[PDB]
From a paper:
Nsp1 is a two-domain protein with a short C-terminal domain, which is involved in the shutdown of host expression by blocking the entry of host mRNA in the ribosome. The C-terminal domain is connected via a linker region with the larger N-terminal domain, which is thought to be involved in circumventing the shutdown of expression of viral mRNA and stabilising the binding of the C-terminus to the ribosome. Therefore, nsp1 is considered as a potential target for antiviral drug discovery. Using sulphur and chlorine anomalous difference Fourier maps, we report the unambiguous identification of the binding orientation of four nsp1-targeting fragment hits.
However, our new more detailed approach employed here clearly reveals two orientations for the sulphur atom. Based on their intensity we could also estimate the occupancy for each orientation with a preference of the sulphur atom in the thiophene ring pointing towards the protein surface and establishing hydrogen bond interaction with Lys47 rather than pointing towards the solvent. As both sulphur difference peaks are located on the same ring, our approach is powerful enough to pinpoint individual atoms on a five-membered ring system with a distance of only 2.6 Å between them.
Author numbering: 10 to 76, 79 to 126
Amino acid sequence: EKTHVQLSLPVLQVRDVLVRGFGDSVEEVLSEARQHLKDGTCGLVEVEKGVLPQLEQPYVFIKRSDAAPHGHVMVELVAELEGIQYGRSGETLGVLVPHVGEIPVAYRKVLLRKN
Ligand SMILES: CNCc1ccc(-c2cccs2)cc1
């Protein structure tokens, strides 16, 4: 199990997302996010004004962890619940959500730390 894995994540528009979060506690959302990333069933929503209030907390963000092998920006997971974050990292790339067949607008290449 390598420390990092290259993934191409489907980028979803928030209004298309059918399942708006991964669960109900910080530990669950991180766990489920990781399982969906493993299974190829995880999408990414880019954060713009109006996005977060349309998604369910706790949130799972991917944040930049370094400073980009082979096109894939190195990232790690950080969860947020009620204004508190669980992890510290760099800039947010987006919020992770389950992917259940929505049509993406792009794919985002990342090198994800499995931590
Ligand atoms: C290439 N697809 C295989 C694979 C994908 C993702 C992961 C994980 C992501 C986060 C924790 S495990 C592991 C294996």
